[PDB]
């Protein structure tokens, strides 16, 4: 990961994260995930 002394850790994907993502990408995901499709096909929560 050495590139002429330039650090790319933030933008590069992180193997530690279960979904390989940038630490910056991890931040961006958390802020804007106000709503989702819900993925509730079971609908067991209703009734």
């Amino acid at each position: 990961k050495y590139f002429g002394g330039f650090n790319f850790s933030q933008i590069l994907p992180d193997p530690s994260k279960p979904s390989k993502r940038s630490p910056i990408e991890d931040l961006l995901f958390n802020k804007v995930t106000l709503a989702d499709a819900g993925f509730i096909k079971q609908y067991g929560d209703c009734l």
């Binding site: 993925f39 096909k41 079971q42 209703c46 009734l47």
Partner: protein, 99 residues
Amino acid sequence: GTGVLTESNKKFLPFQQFGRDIADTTDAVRDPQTLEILDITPCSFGGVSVITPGTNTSNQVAVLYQGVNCTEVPVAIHADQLTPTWRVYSTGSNVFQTR
């Protein structure tokens, strides 16, 4: 109305008889004979999409049930189901639960 009826866990005040959702449709009600709060939910629905290689290539089809859990999918109910004429075969054709 038409729907499936289960016992309603929502706490329901003595003067209260009807419950309404965000759309204000009646979702809970107390039985007349004995006051029993019962939640009303619509009977199972789901869009259906057909995947086909093309009539020129073949006649085999693949059916995707939009947004339905595979186990809750109704296949035995041929008589009471929209698009009833499809039995969509059965579990014998391998079924994959997709996202």
